[PDB]
Design a protein around this ligand. Structure first.
Ligand SMILES: Cc1cc2nc3c(=O)[nH]c(=O)nc-3n(C[C@H](O)[C@H](O)[C@H](O)COP(=O)(O)O)c2cc1C
Ligand SMILES: Cc1cc2nc3c(=O)[nH]c(=O)nc-3n(C[C@H](O)[C@H](O)[C@H](O)COP(=O)(O)O)c2cc1C
Lengths: 183, 171
C-alpha cells in the first residue's frame, strides 16, 4: 500500500473477524504506536493486548464496571458482549507524569496518536480496526483492571481484526473548504 | 512511492525546515489527510489555519503580544516573536468542540490532535516533513482570539512544515 494513499483514504472498520493480526504483523502494529509524536520523549503510554481468553476476562471486567456505574440491563449486556466484536483489542493507557514543561493533555494526546497509528498499521497490512471509548474508560473498576494511577487515562479500546468489508476505494477525497482559512 | 507501513514504522518529525513549503496539490493533500482523522460522532471538530508569507509576520505579532501581556521578559518576548520564522509554512489546528454528552470534549480534542499527526505524515509522505509544536502561548487569551477560539475550543498544535535537511502487557 502507498503511504499517501493510506493517509488520504484512511477509514476504520467496525465489522471485524478472524484472523486477528498476530506474530510479526501485530508487532508491526505495536511499533507503529510507539512512533507517536511525544513532547519531551516521555513515552507516556501503556498497551494491553486482549485476545483469546483475554476477551472473556475483558468481558467480565467491563460487566463489573457497567454494574458499578449503575447502568441498566441493556448497558450491562452491551458491556458483556463488547469484546466479542473483534478477535483482538488493544487498550491504550496514557501513563502521565508530572512534567511542568509538558502539560498532561499533550501526554494524553501522544497516547491517542498511538491508537490512530496502530489502526493505520493494521490497515496498511490488510487488517483494520476501530478506536472505541465510551463511558467505561472512566469506570474505576475498568481503570483498575488496566492498572491506572490517578493521573493516568484510558484513551481508547482499539478493536482489531480482518474487516468483513474491504476498505472502500470508491469514495471522493474530503472537501477542505469549510475547515481551512488563510491566517 | 513511499510504502505505507514504512511511513508508520519509521515515522519521524523534522525541526530543521526550509523552503520550499508544500504548495498547491501537495498542500491540499496534507489538508485532506487531516480531514480523515478518526472522529467520534463525525462531529468534524477541527479548524485549520494556513500561516505563510505575510501571515507569518501576523502570527509573529500575535505571539509577541501574548508573551508581552503575560509579563514575559525581553528574552521570552523575542523568542515568541521569532518562533514562526523557523519554517516556511505553519498550520494551526483548533479543536472546535461542541457539547454532546456521548462525545466528551477530550475525544474531540483527540480527533483534532490526530489531524495534526496525519498532516505531518502527509508532508513526510510527499518528501516534506514538519514538527508538531505547542508551547505555553497556545493558552494565551490574545493568541486564542487570533485563531477564533470560543471558550470551549482549544489550540492543539502549531504544525511547522517545510523541506527537511517495556510498554506492552498481555491482559
Ligand atoms: C478519541 C476517539 C474515541 C472514539 N470512540 C468511539 C466509540 O466509542 N464508538 C464508535 O463507534 N466510534 C468511536 N470513535 C470514532 C471511530 O474511531 C471512527 O473514526 C468512526 O467509526 C468513523 O469512521 P472513520 O474512521 O472510518 O471515518 C472514536 C474516535 C476518537 C478519535
Ligand atoms: C501535542 C504535542 C505537542 C508537542 N509540542 C512540541 C513542542 O512545542 N516543541 C517540540 O520540540 N516538540 C513538541 N512535540 C513533540 C514533537 O512533535 C516531536 O514528536 C518530537 O520532536 C520528537 O520527534 P519525533 O516525532 O520524530 O519522534 C509535541 C508533541 C505533541 C504530541
Amino acid at each position: 500500500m502507498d503511504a499517501l494513499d493510506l493517509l488520504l483514504n484512511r477509514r476504520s472498520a467496525s465489522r471485524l473477524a478472524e484472523p486477528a493480526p498476530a506474530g510479526e504483523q501485530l508487532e508491526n502494529i505495536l511499533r507503529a504506536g510507539l512512533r507517536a509524536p511525544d513532547h519531551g520523549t516521555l513515552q507516556p503510554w501503556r498497551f494491553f493486548i486482549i485476545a483469546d481468553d483475554g476477551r472473556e476476562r475483558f468481558s467480565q471486567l467491563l460487566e463489573k464496571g457497567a454494574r458499578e456505574a449503575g447502568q441498566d440491563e441493556k448497558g450491562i449486556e452491551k458491556a458483556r458482549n463488547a469484546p466479542f466484536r473483534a478477535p483482538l483489542i488493544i487498550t491504550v493507557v496514557a501513563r502521565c507524569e508530572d512534567h511542568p514543561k509538558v502539560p498532561r493533555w499533550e501526554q494524553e494526546m501522544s497516547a491517542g496518536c498511538a491508537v490512530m497509528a496502530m489502526q493505520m498499521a493494521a490497515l496498511a497490512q490488510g487488517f483494520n480496526g476501530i478506536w472505541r471509548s465510551g463511558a467505561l474508560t472512566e469506570s474505576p473498576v475498568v481503570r483498575a483492571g488496566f492498572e491506572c494511577r490517578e493521573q493516568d487515562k484510558i484513551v481508547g479500546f482499539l478493536y482489531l481484526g480482518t474487516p468483513q468489508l474491504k476498505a472502500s476505494t470508491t469514495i471522493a477525497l474530503p472537501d477542505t473548504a469549510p475547515f481551512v482559512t488563510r491566517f
